[PDB]
Amino acid sequence: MLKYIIPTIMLMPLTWLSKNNMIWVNSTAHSLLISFTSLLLMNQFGDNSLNFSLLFFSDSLSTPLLILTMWLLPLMLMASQHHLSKENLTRKKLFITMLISLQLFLIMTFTAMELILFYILFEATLVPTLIIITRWGNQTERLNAGLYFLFYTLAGSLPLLVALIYIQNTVGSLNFLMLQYWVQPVHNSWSNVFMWLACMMAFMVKMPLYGLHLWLPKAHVEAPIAGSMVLAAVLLKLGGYGMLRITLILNPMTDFMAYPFIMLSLWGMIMTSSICLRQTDLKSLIAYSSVSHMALVIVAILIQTPWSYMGATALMIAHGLTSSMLFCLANSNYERIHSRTMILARGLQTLLPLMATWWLLASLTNLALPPTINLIGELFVVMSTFSWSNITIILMGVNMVITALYSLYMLIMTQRGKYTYHINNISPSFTRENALMSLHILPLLLLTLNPKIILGPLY
């Protein structure tokens, strides 16, 4: 993985040694080159994972998440450089450095063989993410958003550390390849019940599980655009990736331990989808939309079927592009009217015809129109949970209806109707913004032609 670690590290001297007016050009250009080389990780085999060294490996689960991570860095750079234009040069370079350091931790997190190494990197992502929100958010309550985000995580992550160290003592190793062969069944006991919860609750908070989700809308409303993009697209999936890995060593106890979380997820997805129908902050609506989509991922992971794991992988990738695109669309309006209130600026299709098309496409993928990979992932989960219990189709189907309702409600409210009379600063869409939207949706739709590369190891 050094061919990705080192050039990512070199982005830092590139940014600091660039001419003052070239920092965005150079960092964007070279981060795109790193993203191109990331496609060499597609050398996956049917039986064995791609095991580079004693520290790093890449299977079909981590590879799509790696590609998404390195694709997202140039997009965040493009999305950030406008609202940071007045920032002084050193603080701009520090901002870009946080984004680069976030990529560094993320690609190492997704490729670590040993689970303590994954833990340290998994925890290290907190620092630049917290700094990005509290330093470069606009509003007063970004400070509280940082503390909620920080302490929700550490409330779950410290028990995980204790469990991980306990598991190594008992088993002798935390190398994930070793765990596949030395794994032993988890028998029933109160000790194993708390081992299970310690192994899982940290990832539940990240997803976030319904009932542990209130940090997320708080974080999004305060974060700058790049913060929301990485948070929605990658940082949530750290918990999804963590669960997909650690469930290996939790059988058969997951059989009955999953129930309360499945109930929270299955009911939570309806609750959060309904909440979206009444949200007045556009960013908060997209944040609640993520909670609803990630509830499906949690169910998929917990029921542990080949179909559910494939759906979970596709849903995680598909949501990452879709939700990141929606924050970018929401942010493009915000950079004109300086408000996140959804009802403030209406009828924008009359004023911004092509941005209306991007809104339309983002909404269509959000409601999982066939054959977008959004639907492929959702459909696979719906398929698998029906076998788990046929009654789940009722909650799955109802959630589909509500998702279509709030997705299109977003579109109708902001883009259709009459334009607000007094808002007279809706300038034409910039090339940067149109490129940013298209750099989300085009790869997302191209993945329809070859979905297999996002379906994960169970494919």
């Binding site: 909620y148 302490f151 609750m271 309904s274 909440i275 129908l277 009444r278 080949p306 179909w307 494939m310 009828g347 299709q349 009359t350 269509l364 129109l369 066939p370 054959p371 459909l379 696979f380 719906v382 398929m383 029906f386 076998s387 046929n390 189709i393 009722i394 799955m396 189907g397 109802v398 589909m400 209806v401 279509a404 309702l405 299109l408 409600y409 109708i412 883009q415 259709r416 109707g417 009459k418 979905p451 297999k452 379906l455 494919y459």
Partner: protein, 592 residues
């Protein structure tokens, strides 16, 4: 083989070419609508060749040209089914769509986004042909949802209008409720039969098919606006008139019926499913025909006519007559699309007036529109030997002589009578009597795009039923022996309906004032279903959202003031050392 399979795919590839040219390779904005219309007319010709080969020898084939994805033991391929139903439906849909686009070139002439309008109509047609040729449930789902979203985009065409946006979202709402049935059937078929391909489902021939078919029936109920998920179809009249003509004839609404026809190998062995679809169609056909009796908006009368006709098709499915139900889809397409185009002709000549109470006296002022409307109405009401007669009277005869629910049979017959009444209502209030429109007369139908498009559909409404019925192979044994009173029932009830309708229509001319009855209000306000359900259900859902870090932080803050609120006195601190030393010994024995 090679000509059959190549030309059937050329039909589909040709339709997508105007969409690809939007990427500006060789794009002529000056007359994009003419370009789109020409492709539809050429696709119709290319599709008539494999249809002719099918009629000749019964040639049918499946094309699985592209392997898209394999999920363990489930291989998904782009797969096309060129069979009876697709070979007959595609030329009809293309022929009707050919007229509607030619009509649209005149109706939407002043729309500044006419180019986008024709792209959306073309996409709407493409998604329907995906749906009709699909050989596996996933490919069929693509078309299913595609027509749903194209109907959202076209119903909400005038997006500055709140009621247009509301109607567009309502169609999405009701169709996604029916989509719950679609995914249920998909999940049952995968779990129990390990497949989404129609070939394997029919081969395995499950006998416990109640669950998958109930799902399909639910999906059909949403798509074809059967009672329960029915209000969105009349609301869809928000769209421009060409949208209604194409929505109600050759695309969206018949998809629900088409899905059930695709699955007749399963439904023909399930009496329980037959009983359900029979009663669903019966209540639908009667209820919507009853709504139509009092409607004053010409587009809504025709929309409720489509709902009633859809209910009849559902009834035909319920009596285990899938091929008859399919014949009614084809025949219905010709004259229903013509009726909308005639209403559009009137509305355009009356400066966007749609209330029939402000029409009248158009019989001579608009001769060609009058001729087509009379033909269309007589075709709809089963006038012997016109296009509608060749399906409806076979359907009524088959129902009359079947082992059936008796109440459903009576409801269908009364609905047939009601068809005559609301057809007379359009003719009487639009064409007869005295002009009730404003004083500046801008009546003019002398446009070739208008005359020709209606002319081609008028010819379809005369001969299409006869031509189609004499070319399709027999797949059932039609019932032809029956008592005279079962043989003539549809004709007799139709004639009584006309007679009754004429007495009522002429009574409006008497100088008597009539108060509203309860039945009149029930009919005019649609059984109150929209008023109650569209207020109560959104209110209950939109309200139910309304109806600890703070505590932990409060606990720590309080525990901090206990620890730190200290006097700073030497005496008190060292006194606490003594208590600690005493406790360490007496209580915990740390000295042992």
């Amino acid at each position: 083989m090679n000509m059959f399979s190549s030309l059937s795919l050329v039909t589909l590839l040709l339709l997508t070419m105007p969409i690809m040219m939007m990427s500006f390779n060789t794009y002529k904005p000056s007359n994009y609508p003419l370009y789109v219309k020409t492709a539809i007319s050429y696709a119709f010709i290319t599709s008539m060749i494999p249809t002719m080969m099918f009629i000749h020898s019964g040639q049918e084939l499946i094309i699985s040209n592209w392997h898209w994805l394999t999920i363990q033991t489930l291989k998904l391929s782009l797969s096309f089914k060129m069979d009876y139903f697709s070979m007959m439906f595609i030329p009809v849909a293309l022929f009707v769509t050919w007229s509607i686009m030619e009509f649209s070139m005149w109706y939407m002439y002043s729309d500044p986004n006419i180019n986008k309008f024709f792209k959306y109509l073309l996409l709407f047609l493409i998604t329907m042909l995906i749906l009709v040729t699909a050989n596996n449930l996933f490919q069929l789902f693509i078309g299913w949802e595609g027509v749903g979203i194209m109907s959202f985009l076209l119903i909400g065409w005038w997006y500055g209008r709140a009621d247009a946006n509301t109607a567009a979202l309502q169609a999405i709402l009701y169709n996604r409720i029916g989509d719950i049935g679609f995914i249920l059937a998909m999940a049952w078929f995968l779990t129990n039969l390990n497949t989404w391909d129609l070939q394997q489902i029919f081969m395995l021939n499950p006998s416990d098919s109640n669950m998958p078919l109930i799902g399909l029936a639910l999906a059909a109920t949403g798509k074809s606006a059967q009672f329960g998920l029915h209000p969105w179809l009349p609301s869809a009249m928000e769209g421009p008139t060409p949208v209604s003509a194409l929505l109600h004839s050759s695309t969206m609404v018949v998809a629900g019926i088409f899905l059930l026809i695709r699955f007749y190998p399963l439904t023909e062995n399930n009496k329980y499913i037959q009983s359900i679809t029979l009663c669903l169609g019966a209540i639908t056909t009667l209820f919507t025909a009853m709504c139509a009796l009092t409607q004053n908006d010409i587009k809504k009368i025709i929309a409720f006519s489509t709902s009633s006709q859809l209910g009849l098709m559902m009834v035909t499915i319920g009596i285990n007559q899938p091929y008859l139900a399919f014949l009614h889809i084809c025949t219905h397409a010709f004259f229903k699309a013509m009726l909308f185009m005639c209403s559009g002709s009137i509305i355009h000549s009356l400066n966007d007036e749609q209330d029939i109470r402000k029409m009248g006296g158009l019989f001579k002022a608009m001769p060609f529109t009058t001729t087509a409307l009379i033909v269309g109405s007589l075709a709809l009401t089963g006038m012997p030997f016109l296009t509608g007669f060749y399906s409806k009277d076979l359907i009524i005869e088959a129902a009359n002589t079947s082992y059936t629910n008796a109440w459903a049979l009576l409801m269908t017959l009364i609905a047939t009578s009601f068809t005559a009444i609301y057809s007379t209502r359009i003719i009487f209030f639009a064409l007869l009597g005295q002009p009730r429109f404003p004083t500046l007369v801008n009546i003019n139908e002398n446009n070739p795009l208008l005359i020709n498009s209606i002319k081609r559909l008028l010819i379809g409404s005369l001969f299409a039923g006869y031509i189609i019925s004499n070319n399709i192979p027999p797949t059932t044994i039609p019932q032809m022996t029956m008592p005279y009173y079962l043989k003539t029932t549809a004709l007799i009830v139709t004639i009584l309906g006309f007679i009754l309708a004429l007495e009522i229509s002429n009574m409006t001319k008497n100088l008597k004032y009539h108060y509203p009855s309860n039945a009149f209000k029930f009919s005019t306000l649609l059984g109150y279903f929209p008023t109650i359900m569209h207020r109560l259900a959104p209110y209950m859902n939109l309200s139910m959202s309304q109806k600890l870090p703070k505590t932990i932080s409060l606990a720590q803050m309080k525990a901090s003031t206990l620890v730190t609120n200290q006097k700073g006195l030497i005496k008190l601190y060292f006194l606490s050392f003594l208590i600690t030393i005493l406790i360490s010994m007496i209580l915990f024995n740390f000295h042992e």
